[PDB]
C-alpha cells in the first residue's frame, strides 16, 4: 500500500506544477484533503520507525515534503479560511507532519503583509481566543500562535512611523480590552500548579515579549490599564525560572522608565537587581539597569543640599556586604562605569573603594581581557571625575589622599608595563588599550592635576630594573634581531612600553632631579642605547605628533641633553657612538650622533671620518646596487 501512496503523492504533486492553468480547482475539495492528511500521517508514522522496506526510504522522505508542499498550496487559495490554517498548525505542532519553509513563507506574504487593517484584528482575536484558556491546544501550539501574533504588531508599528502622531487604528479599544482580560486582568490563583505541563515557559516568555513590545511602542495607550499591568508584572516576578524572572524585571523597568511609580517599588526592584549574582541572564540585568537607573533622580528626588541618597548608599551597602564574591564587584563596577555623572557627587565613598579594588579586579600575573578593560574603564571613570571637578572649579572639595594617588599611579605603571599590545612605531615590521592607558597617564600628571606629585616620585626602580636590566633581557637586547629564537615578542613589547612610560614621566620631571639622578638614568639607559634594534632607537630618539595622539612629549635623549647646563653625559654618549660605529652597528651610532648634533654641532667634527666611511662603504653602495638591480629586473 505504501508504494501506491507514494505514487499517488508523486502524481498529485506533478499535477498543479503549472498553476497558471486554472486546473487547481480540484484543491478546494475537503474530503480529498482529509484523505491526503490521513495517508500522510500514516506514512510519516511508518517512517518514524524503521519499518519500511530498505528499498523505500528516500522515496518516502521526498514524498513527505511533496505532501507538505501540496497542503500549503491548497492553503494558499482562500487565505481567509483560517480554520484550515489552525488545523494545519495543530497537525504540525502535534508531531504529525514535518515542517517545511513553505508554511512560514505563506504566513508571511499572506497574513503578516496583508494590505488591510481588517483581517488583522480578527486574526489577533482568534489567536487570543485559542490562547485564552479553552484547553484543546497544547503549549507548542500556543507558542506558534504567538509566532504569528507578534509579527503583525511589529509590522503595524513599522507602517505607522511618521511625524503626525500616527494612531494605531488596528489597536482599537476592543483589542486592548480583550488582551487585558485574557492576559493582564486574569490573576492566576496558583500558576505554579500549572507548571506540571511542558513548554509553558516558552508561552510565558512570548506573552512577556508581547507586553514589553506593546509598552515600549504604545505607552500612550495603557493609561487605563497601568494598575493591571503593574499587578501582572509583579506577579510574574515570583516565577522560579531565571529567564522568565529577568524578563519580568525588564518589563517592569520598561514601565518605570515610561511611567511614574512611587519610590518604594523602584527602590525595592533596584536593590533586588543589585543583589543578583547568577551568571545567567546577565544581559537582561544590564538592560534593566540601563532602562531604570538614568531616570532614578526623577523617581527618587533628594532634598536640596543633601548628598546622601538612599539609592546612592545601597550600592555601597552591597559592596560592603558581599565583598567576598568577585562576581558581585565586577557587576557593580560594570554598572558604575556606564554612569559617571550620577555618582560624581557621591564619589567621596567610591573613589577609595575603586582604588583598593583595582588590584583585585585584574591579576598582575595573568588577567583576562574583560578584567583589563574593566580596570581601565574604572581608571577612566575616576579621571573623568577629576576632570569634572577641575572644570566645575574653573567654571574644600573632596580630594583623594596622596597615598591613594601613589598606589593608583604605581598600579597603572605596572599595568602599562605588563600590557599585551605594542606601542605603534614608524619602524614596526609589517593597540587601543595601550593608547588609552598612555593618554590617561599623560593627562593625570598635568601640573594643575596630580602633576604636583612628580617631585617626590622616583623612577619606579623595581619595575624598571626587573624589565630592562634583566640578564635575559640584556642578552636578548644584545642578541641579533635576525634570529627569531632571541626575538621574544612579549619581552620586547614590555621594553617598548616601559620606555614610553619613562619618557612620559621624564617629560614632567625637574631639571635638578635629572642632574642629581644622572647616574641612575645612565645605568638604566646604557643597555638600550647600545641596542641594534630599530624600534628601540625609535622609542629613544623619535617623537612624532601622529603616533603620540596629539601630545607634545619631547624625546628622552633631547630632554636629558637640554637639562645639561650650556658634561659627563656628552662624553659618555660620544664614547657610545664611537664604539658603536667602530663595531659596525650604524643604527645606534647614527641616531646618537643625530641627537648630539641637534644639541651641539661642535662634537661631530671628530666623528666626520666614521660617518663618511660608513656612507662610502655600506649604505649608499647597497642603495645604489639595489636600485641598479631593480633597473636590471
Amino acid at each position: 500500500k505504501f508504494i501506491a501512496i507514494i505514487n499517488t503523492i508523486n502524481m498529485l504533486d506533478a499535477l498543479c506544477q503549472f498553476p497558471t492553468a486554472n486546473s487547481q480547482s480540484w484543491l478546494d475539495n475537503k474530503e480529498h484533503i482529509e484523505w491526503l492528511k490521513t495517508v500522510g500521517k500514516e506514512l510519516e508514522l511508518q517512517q518514524k520507525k524503521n519499518s519500511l522496506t530498505p528499498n523505500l526510504r528516500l522515496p518516502a522522505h521526498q514524498a513527505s515534503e511533496q505532501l507538505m508542499n501540496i497542503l500549503t498550496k491548497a492553503l494558499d487559495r482562500n487565505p481567509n479560511d483560517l480554520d484550515a490554517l489552525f488545523s494545519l498548525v495543530e497537525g504540525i505542532t502535534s508531531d504529525d507532519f514535518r515542517e517545511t519553509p513553505a508554511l512560514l513563507s505563506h504566513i508571511y506574504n499572506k497574513i503578516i503583509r496583508s494590505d488591510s487593517i481588517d483581517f488583522w484584528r480578527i486574526t489577533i482575536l482568534r489567536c487570543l481566543d485559542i490562547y485564552s484558556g479553552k484547553t484543546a491546544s497544547q503549549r507548542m501550539k500556543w507558542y506558534l500562535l504567538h509566532n504569528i501574533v507578534n509579527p503583525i504588531i511589529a509590522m503595524d508599528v513599522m507602517r505607522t512611523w511618521d511625524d503626525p502622531n500616527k494612531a494605531s487604528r488596528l489597536l482599537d479599544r476592543t483589542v486592548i480590552d480583550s488582551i487585558n482580560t485574557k492576559i493582564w486582568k486574569v490573576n492566576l490563583p496558583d500558576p505554579q500548579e500549572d507548571l506540571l505541563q511542558p513548554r509553558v515557559d516558552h508561552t510565558r516568555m512570548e506573552v512577556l515579549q508581547l507586553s514589553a513590545m506593546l509598552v515600549k511602542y504604545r505607552h500612550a495607550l495603557l493609561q487605563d490599564a497601568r494598575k493591571d499591568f503593574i499587578k501582572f508584572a509583579w506577579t510574574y516576578i515570583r516565577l522560579d525560572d531565571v529567564i522568565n524572572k529577568h524578563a519580568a524585571y525588564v518589563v517592569i523597568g520598561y514601565f518605570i522608565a515610561h511611567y511614574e511609580t512611587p519610590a518604594k517599588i523602584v527602590s525595592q526592584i533596584y536593590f533586588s537587581l543589585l543583589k543578583t549574582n547568577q551568571n545567567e541572564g546577565r544581559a537582561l540585568v544590564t538592560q534593566a539597569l540601563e532602562l531604570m537607573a538614568p531616570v532614578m533622580p526623577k523617581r527618587c528626588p533628594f532634598p536640596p543640599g543633601d548628598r546622601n541618597p538612599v539609592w546612592a548608599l545601597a550600592p555601597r551597602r552591597i559592596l560592603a556586604e558581599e565583598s567576598q564574591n568577585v562576581q558581585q564587584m565586577t557587576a557593580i563596577f560594570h554598572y558604575l562605569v556606564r554612569h559617571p555623572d550620577l555618582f560624581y557627587d557621591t564619589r567621596d565613598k567610591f573613589a577609595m573603594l575603586i582604588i583598593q579594588c583595582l588590584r583585585k579586579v585584574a591579576s598582575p600575573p595573568n588577567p583576562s581581557n574583560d578584567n583589563r578593560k574593566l580596570a581601565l574603564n574604572m581608571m577612566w571613570l575616576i579621571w573623568q571625575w577629576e576632570q569634572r571637578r577641575v572644570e566645575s572649579k574653573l567654571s574644600a572639595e573632596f580630594q583623594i589622599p596622596s597615598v591613594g594617588r601613589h598606589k593608583m599611579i604605581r598600579y597603572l605603571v605596572e599595568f602599562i608595563a605588563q600590557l599585551n599590545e605594542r606601542y605603534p612605531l614608524p619602524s614596526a615590521r609589517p593597540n587601543e588599550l595601550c593608547k588609552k592607558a598612555t593618554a590617561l597617564l599623560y593627562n593625570l600628571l598635568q601640573p594643575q592635576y596630580w602633576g604636583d606629585l612628580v617631585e617626590e616620585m622616583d623612577l619606579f626602580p623595581n619595575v624598571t630594573d626587573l624589565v630592562l636590566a634583566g640578564e635575559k633581557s640584556a642578552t636578548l637586547l644584545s642578541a641579533d634581531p635576525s634570529d627569531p629564537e632571541k626575538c621574544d615578542d612579549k619581552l620586547i613589547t614590555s621594553i617598548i612600553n616601559t620606555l614610553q612610560v619613562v619618557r612620559i614621566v621624564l617629560h614632567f620631571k625637574s631639571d635638578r632631579w635629572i642632574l642629581d639622578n644622572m647616574p641612575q638614568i645612565q645605568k638604566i639607559l646604557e643597555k638600550c642605547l647600545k641596542s641594534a634594534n630599530p624600534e628601540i632607537q625609535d622609542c629613544l630618539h623619535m617623537a612624532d605628533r601622529k603616533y603620540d595622539g596629539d601630545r607634545d612629549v619631547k624625546p628622552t635623549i633631547k630632554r636629558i641633553l637640554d637639562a645639561v647646563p650650556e658634561s659627563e653625559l656628552i662624553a659618555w654618549l660620544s664614547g657610545i657612538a664611537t664604539e658603536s660605529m667602530a663595531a659596525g652597528n650604524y643604527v645606534s651610532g647614527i641616531n646618537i650622533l643625530w641627537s648630539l648634533g641637534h644639541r651641539k654641532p661642535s662634537i661631530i667634527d671628530q666623528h666626520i671620518p666614521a660617518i663618511m666611511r660608513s656612507l662610502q662603504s655600506k649604505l649608499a653602495r647597497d642603495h645604489v646596487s639595489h636600485y641598479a638591480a631593480l633597473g636590471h629586473q
Binding site: 530498505p54 526510504r57 512560514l104 511589529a154 513599522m158 513548554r199 516568555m205 515600549k216 545567567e280 544581559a283
Partner: protein
C-alpha cells in the same frame, strides 16, 4: 571612636529597644570594620570580643525567628560574620593563632549542636580558619574528620526520615537533618585535603563506602515512578508528583551532584580505591539526569562539567551501553527553558566528543541515531554558527566510520542522507543572503557611530524589518550581539568553507561502497574505473540539488581572465576548484544527465556572480 567604646562597654555590662540598639551597633561595627580590620590594635579587640561571644554562644538554641529571637539571631549573625570577614591571612603579624584552640573547639561544638542558619556559617568559618591557622591547629583535624564522617553516615537516615517515613510560625530543625550543610561539605573537605597532607591516606578508605552509599541512595516515589514508566515502555522525567516537599527533593539532587563532583575530583589518583564502583556510574548518571528538576539549571551545568571531567580520564568504555539512552533529547536536556536557551552546545559537544572517541565499537542502530540527531542539529536556528560547525565536523568525522558497516545498503543510505543534509543547509544559507548583507552594513555604521546604546524608540533609527526578522523584533534581548561582535557574512563564509572541505572526504568514502556485481564494467576508460556507480532516480535529484544550491552560495564573496589578482581572490578560486573536483568522482552517465539539466540554470546564475 567614642561610639565604639560606649557600645563595647554596654555589651560588656550586658552580661527590645536595648537589644535592637545592640544589634544595630554590632552590625554597624561589622560594616565599618574596614577602617579597623588591619592594624596594630587588633589583639586588644580580639581578646576583648572573644569572651563575650563565647559566653553568649553557650545559651540554648533558639528556633523561633520573631521578636527578641530574631534580634538575637541577627546579633549572632553579624557577630560571627566578623570571624569570616577578618583578615585571617597567614601573614607574620597574625595575632589570632595563639588564642585559637578554645574558640575553634567551641565553634565545632556549635556545629555539632547548632542549626542550619548557624551551622552553615559555623562550618564555613571553621574551613576558613583551618585554611590559614593550620600552623598549630594541626592536631584537631581528627575531630573534624570524625564529624564529617558522622554527617555522611547519618545522611542515609535523614534522607529516610525526610522521604520514606515522612515561615515565622515554622520551627527550625537541627542542622544535622539538613541537606544544605551536606551539599556544602564536599568543597570544605577538598579544601582541607589541599591544606594538610598527614590525614589523607587512611581516611579516603573510610570515605569511599560513604560516598558509594550516598550516590546509591534513591527515593522510593521516584524509584516506583521510573519502574512504572519502564513497564509502560516510556521514560519518566522531571519530579514525581508524589513528592510532598519539592524543595527537599531539589536539595537532595544538589547534594547528589556535589557528591558526584567530589568523586570526579577524587578519581584523579585514588581511582584504584574506587575500581569496584565503576559499573554503577553510568546508570546513576542517567538517573540523576532524568530526576534533575527543570528549574535548577546550575545543578545540570555542574553535572555536565563533572561528566566532562570524568570522561577526560579515559574511562569511556563503560559508557557504551547507555550511549543510545543518552542520545534522547529529553534525558540530556529536559524541559528547562534556560537550559534549552543556554547550555545545549555544551551538552552536545561533550556527547560528540564521547561518541567520537569510542566510534570503533558502535552498532548500526547507534550510528543511525547519531546521524539523525546531528543532521537535525545542523539545521538548528541558533544565533551563531559554532554549534552548526561542531555538528558538521562530527558528521564528517563519522562519515569515515559509517563506511565499515557489514551491510552496504545502509552505509550508502547514510552517506546519501549526509549529502542531503548538506544540500539543505546550503539552501538555508542561500535564503538568508540579503538579511546578512543588510545586518553587516548596519553593524558597520553602528560601530562607526560610537555612542552608548539605549533600549528606547528613536526617530533617527526607523525599524526596518524583513522576512528573516519574523521572531527577532521584540524588545527583550537574551544575549546582545554587541558582546559577540559577530559579522554574519564572515560566519557564513567560515561554515561554507568547512562544509566544502568535508564534501570531498565524504564523496571519497562513498566511492568505496559499490555493491559488487551490481553494474557491468566490461569496457570503460581507465579514468572511470574507481568512481561511484549505481544511482537510482532519487539520488540523482540529491546530487543535482547539491550542485545547484552550492553554486549559488558564492555570492557571499562579492574581463574574467583576471591575469592579476582582481575581483575574485585566491581563496575563492581554490574553493571553486575544490567544489568542481567533487563531481569528477561519479558515473559518467550521471554526470551527463545532471549537467545537461543544470546548464541553463548555471548560465542564468553567471549573470549575477561573474566569477562562476
Amino acid at each position: 571612636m567614642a561610639t565604639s567604646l560606649i557600645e563595647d562597654v554596654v555589651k560588656k555590662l550586658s552580661v527590645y529597644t536595648e537589644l535592637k540598639v545592640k544589634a544595630e551597633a554590632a552590625c554597624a561595627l561589622r560594616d565599618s570594620l574596614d577602617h579597623y580590620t588591619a592594624g596594630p590594635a587588633y589583639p586588644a579587640f580580639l581578646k576583648k570580643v572573644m569572651p563575650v561571644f563565647i559566653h553568649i554562644l553557650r545559651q540554648q538554641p533558639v528556633f523561633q525567628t520573631t521578636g527578641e529571637q530574631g534580634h538575637m539571631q541577627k546579633l549572632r549573625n553579624c557577630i560571627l560574620e566578623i570571624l569570616h570577614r577578618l583578615p585571617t591571612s597567614q601573614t607574620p603579624p597574625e595575632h589570632f593563632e595563639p588564642y585559637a584552640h578554645e574558640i575553634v573547639d567551641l565553634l565545632l561544638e556549635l556545629v555539632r549542636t547548632d542549626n542550619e542558619d548557624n551551622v552553615i556559617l559555623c562550618v564555613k568559618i571553621l574551613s576558613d580558619i583551618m585554611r590559614h591557622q593550620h600552623k598549630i591547629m594541626s592536631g584537631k583535624v581528627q575531630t573534624f574528620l570524625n564529624l564529617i564522617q558522622e554527617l555522611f553516615e547519618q545522611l542515609d537516615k535523614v534522607v529516610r526520615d525526610q522521604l520514606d517515613n515522612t515561615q515565622a510560625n515554622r520551627l527550625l530543625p537541627r542542622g544535622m537533618y539538613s541537606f544544605k550543610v551536606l551539599a556544602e561539605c564536599p568543597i570544605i573537605v577538598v579544601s582541607i585535603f589541599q591544606v594538610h597532607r598527614s590525614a589523607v591516606t587512611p581516611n579516603v578508605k573510610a570515605f569511599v563506602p560513604l560516598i558509594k552509599s550516598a550516590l546509591l541512595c534513591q527515593a522510593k516515589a521516584q524509584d516506583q515512578a521510573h519502574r512504572e514508566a519502564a513497564a509502560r515502555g516510556t521514560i519518566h522525567i522531571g519530579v514525581s508528583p508524589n513528592i510532598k516537599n519539592r524543595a527537599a527533593f531539589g536539595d537532595f539532587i544538589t547534594a547528589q551532584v556535589k557528591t558526584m563532583s567530589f568523586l570526579a575530583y577524587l578519581l584523579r589518583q585514588y581511582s584504584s580505591q574506587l575500581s569496584d564502583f565503576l559499573p554503577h556510574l553510568p546508570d546513576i548518571i542517567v538517573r540523576l539526569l532524568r530526576d534533575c528538576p527543570r528549574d535548577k539549571s546550575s545543578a545540570r551545568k555542574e553535572l555536565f562539567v563533572a561528566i566532562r571531567h570524568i570522561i577526560n580520564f579515559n574511562f569511556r568504555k563503560i559508557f557504551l551501553p547507555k550511549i543510545d539512552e543518552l542520545l534522547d533529547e529529553r534525558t540530556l536536556v529536559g524541559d528547562g527553558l534556560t537550559v534549552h536557551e543556554t547550555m545545549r552546545p555544551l551538552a552536545y559537544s561533550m556527547l560528540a566528543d564521547l561518541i567520537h572517541h569510542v566510534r570503533d565499537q558502535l552498532s548500526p542502530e547507534q550510528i543511525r541515531k547519531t546521524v539523525e540527531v546531528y543532521t537535525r542539529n545542523l539545521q538548528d536556528n541558533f544565533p551563531g554558527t559554532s554549534f552548526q560547525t561542531m555538528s558538521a565536523k562530527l558528521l564528517l568525522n563519522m562519515a569515515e566510520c559509517i563506511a565499515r558497516l557489514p551491510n552496504k545498503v545502509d552505509a550508502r543510505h547514510y552517506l546519501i542522507m549526509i549529502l542531503n543534509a548538506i544540500a539543505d543547509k546550503f539552501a538555508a544559507m542561500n535564503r538568508q543572503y540579503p538579511n546578512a548583507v543588510k545586518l553587516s552594513k548596519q553593524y558597520a555604521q553602528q560601530a562607526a557611530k560610537n555612542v552608548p546604546e539605549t533600549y528606547l524608540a528613536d526617530k533617527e533609527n526607523p525599524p526596518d524589518w524583513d522576512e528573516i526578522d519574523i521572531f527577532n523584533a521584540t524588545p527583550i534581548k537574551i544575549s546582545n550581539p554587541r558582546d559577540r561582535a559577530a559579522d554574519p557574512v564572515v560566519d557564513n563564509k567560515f561554515l561554507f568553507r568547512n562544509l566544502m572541505t568535508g564534501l570531498k572526504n565524504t564523496f571519497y568514502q562513498l566511492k568505496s561502497c559499490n555493491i559488487p556485481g551490481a553494474v557491468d564494467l566490461t569496457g570503460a576508460p581507465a579514468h572511470w574505473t574507481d568512481v561511484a556507480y549505481g544511482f537510482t532516480a532519487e539520488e540523482v535529484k540529491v546530487i543535482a540539488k547539491l550542485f545547484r544550491e552550492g553554486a549559488y552560495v558564492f555570492r557571499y564573496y562579492e574581463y574574467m581572465a583576471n591575469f592579476y589578482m582582481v575581483s575574485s581572490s585566491k581563496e575563492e578560486k581554490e574553493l571553486l576548484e575544490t567544489f568542481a573536483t567533487v563531481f569528477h568522482c561519479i558515473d559518467p552517465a550521471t554526470f551527463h544527465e545532471v549537467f545537461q539539466q543544470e546548464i541553463p540554470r548555471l548560465y542564468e546564475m553567471i549573470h549575477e556572480h561573474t566569477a562562476l
